[PDB]
Each structure stands twice: as structure tokens, then as C-alpha cells.
Amino acid sequence: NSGLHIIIFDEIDAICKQRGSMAGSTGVHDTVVNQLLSKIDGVEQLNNILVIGMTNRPDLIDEALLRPGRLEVKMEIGLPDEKGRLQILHIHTARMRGHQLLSADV
Amino acid sequence: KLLIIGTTSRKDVLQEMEMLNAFSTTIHVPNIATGEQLLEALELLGNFKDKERTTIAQQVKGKKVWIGIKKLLMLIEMSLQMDPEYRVRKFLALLREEGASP
Amino acid sequence: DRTPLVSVLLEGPPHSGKTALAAKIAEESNFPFIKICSPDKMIGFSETAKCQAMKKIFDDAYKSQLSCVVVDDIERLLDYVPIGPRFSNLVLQALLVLLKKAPPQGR
Numbered sequence A: 001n002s003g004l005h006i007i008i009f010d011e012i013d014a015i016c017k018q019r020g021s022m023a024g025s026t027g028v029h030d031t032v033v034n035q036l037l038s039k040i041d042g043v044e045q046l047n048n049i050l051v052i053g054m055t056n057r058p059d060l061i062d063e064a065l066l067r068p069g070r071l072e073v074k075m076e077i078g079l080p081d082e083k084g085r086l087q088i089l090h091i092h093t094a095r096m097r098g099h100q101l102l103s104a105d106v
Numbered sequence B: 001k002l003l004i005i006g007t008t009s010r011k012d013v014l015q016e017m018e019m020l021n022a023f024s025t026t027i028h029v030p031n032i033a034t035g036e037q038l039l040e041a042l043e044l045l046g047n048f049k050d051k052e053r054t055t056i057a058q059q060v061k062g063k064k065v066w067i068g069i070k071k072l073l074m075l076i077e078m079s080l081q082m083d084p085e086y087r088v089r090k091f092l093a094l095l096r097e098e099g100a101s102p
Numbered sequence C: 001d002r003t004p005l006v007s008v009l010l011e012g013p014p015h016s017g018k019t020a021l022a023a024k025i026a027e028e029s030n031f032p033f034i035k036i037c038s039p040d041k042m043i044g045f046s047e048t049a050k051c052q053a054m055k056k057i058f059d060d061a062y063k064s065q066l067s068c069v070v071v072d073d074i075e076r077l078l079d080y081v082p083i084g085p086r087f088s089n090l091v092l093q094a095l096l097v098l099l100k101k102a103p104p105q106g107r
């Protein structure tokens, strides 16, 4: 009956060792990367967690982390477009409108 | 979509390295090679006088002209630093020194 | 039954479409295990990385009952260049030993 705990990582590629193909040498002993993986599965069966990962280089993610029962959903967040830019400016500029501080000219 | 633009000065070596076969098109950029062209370029830049231009045209009518715009600018700079009397003579002298013949 | 391994090398002048025909032949096999080791997916690597990648691909291929592996553009793969010549003897020695190794019994 426990609630839900969410842990957000970032640039998870940093905890990867499969990025040394192009003279990266950015992989420390796989031990460290094994441990984290065996915290999303193992003999223990945690049932009240949700892990959201974020990255910028999708090509250097260790492959053992993209299988069923593990992080198993990919999605892309592309650049904004005209309508998105309009809406975002409108959002960011609500204050001056709320106080008339913005010029009517703009 | 995508587009790629390349540039080089030694095409033969690239041809030998079987790299040209990768590209899809070629373009040429020739050097100035005629006297009238040189006079037109000088006119467009506008740095030489009327009698000066006439003397230059008289002396350069031989048609043995072959230079690169860049080096033309550098020679013009070098020449302009003399006194007004010897500018044209010195410039013609340097021009003559660089007597290339492709 | 007495020839568990087979090989074939396709060739032709540039831009004749060897890759497409190879892909079509591979696709029309109905085999359960297919792969294509293409150079593009190794840009900027070091010969050791190439060797390890090929090792892994073939190791995985060993685990099935039928398979098909299409190593495309062998020329570029072996870092060639006319002048010299130059290349990486390691990769050559690798592929040459690998193209003759039979899989475990019954595959």
C-alpha cells in the first residue's frame, strides 16, 4: 500500500562505459554501473518506484539498460515551432500585461 | 535535407586519394588572365588616376597577365606607399616581377 | 549436413547497387536471425573497438540455429587508401580467422 517515489537522473550517459570507442576513456569500472542496474531489478522486487532518465547523446547509452523490465520507453523532444514559440512568449510575458507595464506598441 | 560545400586548391592529390568520387559535382574558379579585366577591376576599386590608368593600360597591353585577386590587393597596398611620382613605376615593376606563365 | 558453413563475395564496379541486392537476398531467406554490420555505425572508432564489435556480433550469431550476417563495404571497413598503401593488419587478421570458424555442433 505504499505510495510512489520518483527519482530523476540526468545525463545518465555519464554512468556509462560504452562511450570509449572513439578514445572516450570515460568508462570507469563497470562495477558502478552494475550496481545501479541491480537496483532496478534483482532478487529484491521493489514495486513502488518510477525512474525517469534524461540524456542528450542517445547513442552512448549502455545496452543492458534498454530491455523489458527495465527502462523501456523512449521519446524525443524536438525543437519548438512557430505556434510553440508564440505560446511560450505569451506565457513568459503575462506579468507586464497584468500590470500594464508592457507598452501597447509591441 | 542537407547540403555540403567543399573547397581546396590541389585537385590532383584529392583525385589520387579516390575522394573526388565521393563528391557529386565540381566547379572551377579561374584567376584574372586579361589586361582589360585588370583595368576593369582597378576601375571598380577606384585607386588609380586617369593618366595613371592610361599609362598602366599602355604598359600592360602585352597580355602577359596572371595574378590572384588576393595578391593583387597586397601589391596595390605595397605600391601605394611611395611618393605620387614613383607609385606607378614601382607597381609596374612588382607586377613584372611576378611573371607567371601557366 | 556436412557443410555447416558457407560463404560468398559479391563484387562490381562502383555504384552498381551491390548493397541493395545483398539486402534483398538476406531478407528473402525467412531466417530467424539476421544482422547487417555497416561501417557507418563505427565512425571515429579505434581498431580495438571495431574488433570488439565484430566479436560481439558473431558471438551473438553463434547462439541461434540459423542466421545470416551481412558485413557491408569490406573495403572501407579495413581503413584502405591507395597511397602507401596503408591499413590495419589487426582487422584483416581478425576477419580472416573468423571467416573459417565453424559454430558449435548442430548449427
Ligand SMILES: Nc1ncnc2c1ncn2[C@@H]1O[C@H](COP(=O)(O)OP(=O)(O)OP(=O)(O)O)[C@@H](O)[C@H]1O
Residues within 6 Å of the ligand: C013, C014, C015, C016, C017, C018, C019, C020, C021, C073
Ligand atoms: N534493381 C536494382 N538494382 C540495384 N540497385 C537498384 C535497383 N533498383 C533500385 N536500385 C537503387 O540503386 C541504389 C544502389 O545503392 P547501393 O548503395 O546499393 O550501391 P553501391 O554500389 O553499394 O554504393 P557504394 O558503391 O557507394 O557502396 C539504391 O538507391 C537502390 O534503391
